[PDB]
TrEMBL record, chains A, B:
Domain named Bromo: residues: 17-103
Taxonomic source organism: Leishmania donovani
UniProt entry keywords in alphabetical sequence: Bromodomain
Recorded superkingdom: Eukaryota
Protein name per UniProt: Bromodomain family protein
């Protein structure tokens, strides 16, 4: 199948912004909390949020060069975007581990995000129908 | 005319916990984030949250000694509780000053909390009906 366009990838990332999340995954923590940045970066050495992900989508980072677009399964497709989703969730759960509202939100976003990517892959790549889904692998 | 009981004060404070707030105003930021303890104390040196406020209620702080229970207006009643609500709000806004959603939530809570106190005052001191309400004046 043809790779998704960058516009399609941007639309996909845009679709990951849920009003229910209240901008939780869109905020650059290091910029918004300068006095906690060192403490945050200790626990979360790698930045990730939906602003960075939309920049990556717009640039072709998820769909160009060495990026895996279609893998041998749905789960194994759009690996760079899946890794970013996984890092967003990992950072949230690790740093906010003692706050149940945050962890619950993070897990809800994780499941939602992988389902959205799964659906997107299947819309573009019918040859991957019935293979392992990202929603089944990630958790 | 009788001051509220300690149990009534504890129930009032507990009524300030909203499910939708996800523990925003109940979490002890030091306790949930033990390694941020000293950093937080530096930004918000006088902590306030609904757990501390419930403890203060149990200790009789909101109605004993020099406390103003019923003033000349609703807004002028239960001043020590109102002062704690205000500190809770100020600390939230201080810490989250670069995150507009947090500030919006803190201001939403401020109004809700004062209105809860206002309604409580009017149930215990119906003579104050028609006087200035704290929800209008504490902004």
């Amino acid at each position: 199948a043809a790779p998704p366009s960058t516009r399609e990838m941007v639309q996909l990332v845009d679709s990951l912004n849920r009003r229910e999340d209240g901008g939780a995954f869109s905020v650059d923590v290091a910029e918004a909390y300068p006095d906690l940045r060192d403490s945050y970066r200790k626990i979360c050495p790698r930045p990730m949020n939906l602003i960075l992900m939309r920049q990556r989508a717009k640039e072709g980072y998820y769909t160009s060069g060495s990026a895996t677009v279609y893998g041998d399964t749905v789960a194994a497709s759009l690996t760079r975007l899946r890794e970013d989703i996984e890092l967003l969730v990992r950072n949230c759960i690790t740093f906010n581990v003692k706050v149940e509202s945050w962890v619950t939100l993070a897990r809800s976003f994780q499941a939602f995000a992988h389902r959205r990517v799964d659906d997107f892959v299947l819309r573009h790549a019918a040859f991957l129908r019935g293979t392992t889904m990202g929603a089944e692998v990630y958790e």
